[PDB]
């Protein structure tokens, strides 16, 4: 009863960061050390737990969130960070307990002419609360004039496309990111390492 980590990490297509994908993991055993042992990931950082301790600990629930962002935006996937991704697309709580994994995905997510399928939120009236997800496409009202669905002066479409080109630099590469959240809830432990 191994946890389907290959379902999320080795999935063919990810979601846009504004509409990131969530998968609930329970009722299985997972060797997290095997995940780090493969060295294909560029970022592997954990908060509240050490990587070796994962196999020696149990949790009520596990949550795997998957999306694609830019390279220099991977630093935004961390507690207390700011920026358009952390404030408008995907926010992590200040007391986050879990891990963040990010790896380069240039050969798959980049296309000649620009890959215009991956989007992100540029404008929003207020910051997202932790783990919230906004997928509305209402015209943003940047000024006093009400837009009323009409895009134009001080009235912008809320989403902007990344446009990944294989020839891009390391900062503007498509990076696939997963976030593992670990939940202890005064309930039975359903996800455990080989302990």
């Amino acid at each position, epitope marked *: 009863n191994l946890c389907p980590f290959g379902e999320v990490f080795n999935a063919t297509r990810f979601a846009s960061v504004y509409a990131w994908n*969530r998968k609930r993991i329970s009722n299985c055993v997972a060797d997290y050390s095997v995940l780090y042992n493969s060295a294909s990931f560029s970022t592997f950082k954990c908060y509240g737990v050490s990587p070796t301790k994962l196999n020696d600990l149990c949790f009520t629930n596990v949550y795997a969130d998957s999306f694609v962002i830019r390279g220099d935006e991977v630093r935004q996937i961390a507690p207390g960070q700011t920026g358009k991704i952390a404030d408008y697309n995907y926010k992590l*709580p200040d007391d986050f307990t879990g891990c963040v994994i990010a790896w380069n995905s240039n050969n798959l997510d980049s296309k000649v002419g620009g890959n215009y399928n991956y989007l992100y939120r540029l404008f*929003r*009236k*207020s910051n997202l*609360k*932790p*783990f*919230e*997800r*906004d*997928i*509305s*496409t*209402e*015209i943003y*009202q940047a000024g006093s004039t009400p837009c*009323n*669905g009409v895009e134009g002066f001080n009235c912008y479409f809320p989403l902007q496309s990344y446009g990944f080109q294989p020839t891009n630099g390391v900062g503007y590469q498509p990076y696939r990111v997963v976030v593992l959240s670990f*939940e202890l*809830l*005064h*309930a039975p432990a359903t996800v455990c390492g080989p302990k």
Partner: antibody
Amino acid sequence: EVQLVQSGAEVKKPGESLKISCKGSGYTFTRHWIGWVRQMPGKGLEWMGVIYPGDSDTRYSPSFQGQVTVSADKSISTAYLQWSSLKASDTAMYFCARGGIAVASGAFDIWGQGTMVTVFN
Amino acid sequence: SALTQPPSVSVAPGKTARITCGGNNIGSKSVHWYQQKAGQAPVVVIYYPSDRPSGIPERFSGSNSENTATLTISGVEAGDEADYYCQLWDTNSDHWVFGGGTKLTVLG
């Protein structure tokens, strides 16, 4: 098991104060919204306000702002709704509902029984 | 902003019921649908697009147009008789907004 358990029904006179409690269990209380919805007998649902117990951020409806207070105590996983002076028009059911996250972000995924508040003159 | 629902809708068992919620640019905003049976607390039946909560049958679905959000129940059963509500998120003002409600009656 996610649950929102609300306080018992109340009978109060006009002008009196009232404070209803609403305790959450089975989930991280500080990582969700908690909102209050009013339902007059035989009428529709009306959102009143919302509080994020993580940082005590409060949002109020224009029709309810200033006439009612929403607060929370995260140490015991409870949210509070408070009136300073009740009116006969306040007789209604009051639901407290948890604000979802992820796909449930804009919705209220979990609800309590509701608290019946009767103002009797 | 005003969210408008027909006060009542009646269908025969086995057919399809469509409940409409109206407004200005609702087709671009996040709209959810709740069911409330008589004497019970409300229950979410549809989130935004057409994502269903865990345990909700596949006969419940949601669709949208520029000025309209529609909840569709195909093959209506008797137990589906209840009040249905559309709810708006309204990211402009951070105001959860509530429809008028529609009583879906299954003709028995």
